[PDB]
Amino acid sequence: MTLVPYVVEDTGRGERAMDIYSRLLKDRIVMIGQEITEPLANTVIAQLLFLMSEDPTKDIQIFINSPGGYITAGLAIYDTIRFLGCDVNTYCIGQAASMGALLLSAGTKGKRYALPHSRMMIHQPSGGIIGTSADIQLQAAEILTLKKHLSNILAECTGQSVEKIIEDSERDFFMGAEEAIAYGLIDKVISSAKETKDKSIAS
Amino acid sequence: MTLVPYVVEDTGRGERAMDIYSRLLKDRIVMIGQEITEPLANTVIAQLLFLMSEDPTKDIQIFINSPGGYITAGLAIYDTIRFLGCDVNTYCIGQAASMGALLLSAGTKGKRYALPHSRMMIHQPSGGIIGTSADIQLQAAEILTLKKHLSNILAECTGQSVEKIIEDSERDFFMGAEEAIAYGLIDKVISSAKETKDKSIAS
Amino acid sequence: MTLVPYVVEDTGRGERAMDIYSRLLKDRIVMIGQEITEPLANTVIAQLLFLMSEDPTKDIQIFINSPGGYITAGLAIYDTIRFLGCDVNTYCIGQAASMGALLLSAGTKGKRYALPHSRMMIHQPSGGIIGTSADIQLQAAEILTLKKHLSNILAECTGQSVEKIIEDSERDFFMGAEEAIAYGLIDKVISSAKETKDKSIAS
Amino acid sequence: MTLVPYVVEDTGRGERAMDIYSRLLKDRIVMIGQEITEPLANTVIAQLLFLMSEDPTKDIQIFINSPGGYITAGLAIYDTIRFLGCDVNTYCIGQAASMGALLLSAGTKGKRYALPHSRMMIHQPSGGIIGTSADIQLQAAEILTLKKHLSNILAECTGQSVEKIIEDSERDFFMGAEEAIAYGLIDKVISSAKETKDKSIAS
Amino acid sequence: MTLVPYVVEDTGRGERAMDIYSRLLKDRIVMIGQEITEPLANTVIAQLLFLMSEDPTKDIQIFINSPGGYITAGLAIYDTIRFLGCDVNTYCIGQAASMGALLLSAGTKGKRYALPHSRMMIHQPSGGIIGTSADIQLQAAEILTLKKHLSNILAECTGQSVEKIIEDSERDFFMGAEEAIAYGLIDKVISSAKETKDKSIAS
Amino acid sequence: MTLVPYVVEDTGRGERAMDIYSRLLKDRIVMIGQEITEPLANTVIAQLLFLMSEDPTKDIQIFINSPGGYITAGLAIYDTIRFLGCDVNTYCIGQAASMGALLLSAGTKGKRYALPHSRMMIHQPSGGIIGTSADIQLQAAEILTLKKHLSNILAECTGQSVEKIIEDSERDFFMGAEEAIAYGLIDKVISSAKETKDKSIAS
Amino acid sequence: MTLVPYVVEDTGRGERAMDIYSRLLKDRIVMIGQEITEPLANTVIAQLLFLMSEDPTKDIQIFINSPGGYITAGLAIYDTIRFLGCDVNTYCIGQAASMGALLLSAGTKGKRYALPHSRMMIHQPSGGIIGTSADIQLQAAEILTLKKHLSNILAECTGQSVEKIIEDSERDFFMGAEEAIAYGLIDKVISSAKETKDKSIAS
Amino acid sequence: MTLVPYVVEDTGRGERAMDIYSRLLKDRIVMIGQEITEPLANTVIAQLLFLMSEDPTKDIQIFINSPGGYITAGLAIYDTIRFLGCDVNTYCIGQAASMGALLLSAGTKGKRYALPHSRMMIHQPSGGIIGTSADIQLQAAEILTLKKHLSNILAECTGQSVEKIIEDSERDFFMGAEEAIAYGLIDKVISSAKETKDKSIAS
Amino acid sequence: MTLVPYVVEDTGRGERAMDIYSRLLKDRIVMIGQEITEPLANTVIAQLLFLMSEDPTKDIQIFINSPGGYITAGLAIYDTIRFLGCDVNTYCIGQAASMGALLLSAGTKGKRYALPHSRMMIHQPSGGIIGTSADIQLQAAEILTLKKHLSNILAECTGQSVEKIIEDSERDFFMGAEEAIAYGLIDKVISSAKETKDKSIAS
Ligand SMILES: CC(C)(C(=O)N1CCN(Cc2ccc(Cl)cc2)CC1)S(=O)(=O)c1ccc(C(F)(F)F)cn1
Ligand SMILES: CC(C)(C(=O)N1CCN(Cc2ccc(Cl)cc2)CC1)S(=O)(=O)c1ccc(C(F)(F)F)cn1
Ligand code: NA
Ligand code: NA
Ligand code: NA
Ligand code: NA
């Protein structure tokens, strides 16, 4: 019973019947509240490519509540985030585990936020190289390359060494918002709207 | 099997087709009428983020009829509620158990209401502590952290000690509207619109 | 279920209500983000034939994230791509295996790109004689013609010999963006707007 | 995962929901990309009858990628195509087996095309037909009559004898675009719009 | 909790628990009470070959209540019945349609019986000449061969001409025990054990 | 779910395990406790044919609790009951509707019994016709013969005219044990062992 | 639908409960009455290896009614048949298509039989070489080796050339018992027994 | 689909129903004819541990027809095979891929056989993890250890270098019986009884 | 579908059929080859309680190939193992993770073995709520208590500190047989039956 409410308005002379997620997309807000799967990667990348078509310079806000995902889908989104020319804001509401922590740390330095009770983890809890039979088929020398990619990206994003990233990816523990700042995953804890999201009319 | 009714008003030039829940969202009314799950949390946070992107100062009304949920989803919604800059009114119609009681007590102090026959409980039945179906990855120190977060938030919201909150979270009992006022969960019992802040409609 | 967000443009008060993928199609962007099946081939060819009807000379961008597919569907899309009179840009986001690599290499020479962490393979992964239509069909001597067709097309697109393509098609390994340039599958690696070489001029 | 794309205008302000297949239908393009079943025949005949209501003289383009089908549905579409008063262009993208080859050869002589790597077969793929939820169920003397009809029609369309059509219909082999021209199934192999490089032939 | 009741007697040389159908097999009684399918034909032929393995000279009784079946399965059983060296008694209880009518008429002349209210039909009610492995159906010259085989066997068994058998196979009507004797399908109506060539199998 | 208790035996030199229904079959007791379907008729006829193979002269007891069934299956059992040479005792426990009433009245005259609260009906109840709910087979002019067969048999068994049987088959009402005696369906109401024969000689 | 009768038989020493197929296995009779799949090959090979352990010199009779199968399973059974040291008799009841025809022709030359109305085909129907959705499935050069193996075995077994076997494997036609003798598939058509346990009666 | 014929034989006078696979187990024959999964490994290891309890010195025959499997299950069986003190004979009937080839090459040197048309491959055609609980993740250093174990064991069993084993495990090709002898996977191709160990040793 | 083989024995007294697992149970061998769930624990404890009733002094061998399980089931089995009075031998074939490692280390000191390529982990790979009623019961302070119990038992069994057990339970890594000896999980690596104790002909 997943009710998907809509939005449309009369503060002027208008219309615009769209659902709630398309509305937030009008403010350049992208929601990641899934497991990071291949069908999600396509929808998020599609949203990211569209937002670059509209204004390739305005900031984009990404809100992340993800229990994990797959390396193949996460790497696709990360490369798309790096492919963008504008600044990307990443907010962690709730949990950002494994791939969620990768995309969270992939935001523009200084614009990666978390909420006071957010929890973040680098360990991949689910999906041993392949998880559910929806996303399958990874040989040997291929998971190492994807894991080597993930370790190198996390080390670059956080500022830790690749060795430390590998060691901490083996530990099944979450870290709080304050710990994640020290680790390099995020930049600031917030408790009210950081007005980095402010736009009303384009320019 | 329960029909999502639609709505059409008389703004003259604008005529606008939305369902009943999107209509209530136009009055800054958010409905929580089911278990607090991860997909529901995403919808509720999306609604909350949209309502702040439209009027970040106008009051928001949240109506809660929830048999419970998961701590991770509730903490995400609570942090989003605290993330808002405007006042939040919480109304308990029917039942607000565990996570429903958390969001109910999370409203702005003085603006937390319940109906005469409402029932409220802080005890979390079963193992509703993370995520959704499956999503049951634990370690030890993570349940301790999530329960410590919930106990600390409930103690702050209600005004009771953390020890009392933990002790009462172990008891499977409901409390009425009058008891919930004494406990600190809510502020006032109501039975009509004017029992809240009254704007003095003429007669 | 994956929420496919919708879109609303400017300068007119009306009611589009088109999704994100149809929106990108307005910019002549075609998304291939799943297995290359017969129903998918119909979608891509329909998109390709429509884009030729609107402007048969403007460039078309194809974004590819495909774990593989079937030769029967791949050959249909390739012939349609060669059937186009305009330039085709192919971008590999994530993975392009077997049929994904065929369509990726089918783009206009100089306009085949990949992202820094993309993975490409010509081997048909994890199984497959190719061909399922509620019935396998494609007897022995028919798969040979299709495999010979695929080998000849890959050799023509990449620049390698047919013998090398056949030898490399039996090896279950992926190659990175730099290796794929040397191989002939793609032309350029892409990681920023100023490092494009694509220079997306439109709208 | 599904067939997504939609279409809107350019020659005004942009408001009406058209999917990709109805869009191509506005250019009098009919897509046959699956097994020739009874529900498909109804849709195709409905499209054909509609296209005749708008212009009984405008040319109609039919694109065929079909692994086969049933005699009852194929004969119905063929009779409807012969029922049209305008010229019918048939394009074979990918595979046209049995019923696909019948409808492909049913186009106006001189306007039956195939793509360079297309494969065509007159044999009923896999097995014959008696009907399992797709051709109902057929007595003895009736499948012979329907098979005789198909043999007689193919001989007239291709120019071969009825004996050779029956004689070749038992052989499970595909033929290429060049072989199909010699056989009489099609007229020209192409690599650009309609008659290669132009909506009309030059000499 | 097992259906198909069990039985015990034959205390002479001593034996154990068998089901009811195995009991009748001890009296050389074979039951055909459902559609003549390929798995049923295998069971019946296995039973037919076993009774010939024990003593190839004692009479065999076949009781038939079959609404029809497939020609491939019926021809297999008929050839196995003709392959036997002993006399075969066929009894029609209830209905013997199409394939049931062939096996009924395949008994030794003079030992084909029916009960007073039995109904017999030569028509196959629209569908089924082959069991099929959920993959395959039949070419033209293959239905013709199977129909010729069925017509020739029925003409030989009943004594009618092949033309009349073909004509009557197109008519969807049942015939009674008296009509079936005149037709040649059976030999005698019995309506009791002690009547006619068999005076019951008792002991 | 339909627990079928088992039993173990003295009365021969063998020793063995059967369920409760197979045991009652050793006392020549046949249970009919469900709808008269084609698979049930085969089981009942198999039991009847086996009981004749052991003693074609000893009495057989049939206990009937049937809400109805189909004429094709009922006629098969009735003809098999008439095929027996020994006396058949029919007992109605609970309900005997349509086909159940046919088999009940088919017992040897004087040996058809019912229990004090049993209910009997000649009307064919809610549902399907003569055969199977989905696999349905008789065609035109076949209902006349099958209904005439049922009317003629009921008239002979009960002693009423065919006209009265046809008229009473049209009314949806049950009759008690005393009414069924007057009607001719049964002979005696019973309530103790001595109401049976139990003529002489120990057992 | 369990339709496997059991035996406790008359004509044996002792007391045992085996099903009908195990009974025929005691006479060294192996039944192949369904599609040649991988699980079937394992059971058949198990039966073949058991029969060699019991008496590695006594003849084995195999009865074949198979609509086809897969090359991998067919090759496994054929190699096991060649692995046996005793003579193998193959009987074709009904149909022996593709793999069934391979195993039929694999019997000892001079001891391959068919019934008068049997139908045999060497064409591999439908398509594929293993797989219902993803069963095994093979790369290119591996299915070719299996097809070359099958062609070479059929040519050796029948006596035809490899070229003719390849040509006839592409033609969807059946041949009768007399035609199959001329082709080399079988040796004799039969209509009466020739097996051992002859010239004697039981009891 | 579990057709598993039974047997009752000379473990005495002959009185016990066992299936065909347990039958070969009485001759110390173990069948591996399906995917090597965790439940299969438990059954096979249980069979292996039982066979060592009965006679820890008598030879064991293992027949292998396996399309592949999982590393964890294969390693478990191999360690159990190496744990045995007696000689193990491995026969490859049909296909032995990846894990099947591991167990095949794990037989006692000199006692590893294949049939003339058997196909063997060391490449894992599917890959991925084993789903041991379908809930997990598999880190880096664990796939490396499992792949290193497989490479080291295959190199020791075959005699090739670990580097060659790694290179050939990436190539999707099968090898014939003669090629597998040269490779070291097996020792002899067979077509009759061939080798054994019961006599004075050759020298 | 693994075909759990059956067994036949006692060539002196005769007649019993047990499966392979019940067979090994007669040798006081208990197999744990799956996830340690509540239904599995009941079977294992039942086996353990039976084995103590027959001989409460003879050694018991437990073979473990378990990817994990639930604490409630693991604690139940462990307490039952400690409840036994006889020596318990634990063998790790393949993998012993979390609960499997608990039961493995619960064997009598000096009699805990592993195979050369076995892998052992104390970390619970993904879950840990533990329990029943759709996988979710068991409140917070109760999972913490059960985890404390598990840490205390592992520390006592292995010899490490409780702090080290807690620290290592959070690390997702496997250790080999040699590492497990140093850690305290096991005592000896083995590679053949006769590496420990002595078994020969009885007296
Ligand atoms: C059948 C045996 C005895 C055999 O192979 N022979 C080979 C060669 N013989 C003559 C020979 C000798 C040397 C040379 Cl140079 C050439 C020819 C004689 C016997 S067997 O291999 O012992 C065997 C196979 C299978 C089974 C089982 F599967 F049933 F268990 C049991 N035993
Ligand atoms: C000790 C072993 C090696 C053995 O050989 N035995 C033989 C006979 N026995 C007879 C018996 C019967 C009944 C009873 Cl009451 C008592 C004794 C008992 C044991 S073992 O424990 O079987 C064993 C250990 C490890 C492995 C592994 F490593 F492969 F996994 C496999 N087997
Ligand atoms: Na609680
Ligand atoms: Na590279
Ligand atoms: Na009464
Ligand atoms: Na013939």
Author numbering:
A (entry chain J), B (entry chain H), C (entry chain E), D (entry chain I), E (entry chain K), F (entry chain N), ...: 1 to 203
Reproduce text from the manuscript describing this model.
Here, we report the first crystal structure of full-length ClpP2 as an inactive homotetradecamer in a complex with a candidate antibiotic at 2.66 Å resolution. The asymmetric unit of ctClpP2 includes two opposing heptameric rings that form a tetradecamer with a height of 77 Å and a diameter of 95 Å. The monomers in the crystal structure follow the canonical ClpP fold with the secondary structure consisting of a set of aligned α-helices (α2- α5) behind four β-sheet motifs aligned in the direction of the α-helices (β1-β3 and β5). Lack of hydrogen bonding among the triad indicates that the ctClpP2 residues are in an inactive form and that a conformational change is required for the catalytic residues to interact. First, ctClpP2 is the only ClpP among those compared that has both a flexible N terminus and a mini-helix, also called α8, at the C terminus. Second, the handle loop is more compact and the α5 helix that follows is 2∼3 helical turns shorter in ctClpP2. This means oligomerization leads to a ctClpP2 tetradecamer that is shorter in height, 77 Å, compared to counterparts from other species, > 85 Å, except for saClpP that also has a compact handle domain. The C-terminal loop of ctClpP2 that includes a mini-helix, α8, is situated such that it acts like a lid toward the hydrophobic pocket and mediates a neighboring positive electrostatic environment with residues Lys197 and Lys199 in addition to residues Arg28 and Lys58. For ctClpP2 and ecClpP, the hydrophobic pocket is proximal to a cluster of positively charged surfaces that interact with the electron-rich fluorines of the trifluoromethylpyridine group. While activation of ctClpP2 would have been expected when analyzing drug-bound crystal structures of ClpP homologs, we observed a misaligned triad and thus the inactive form of ctClpP2.
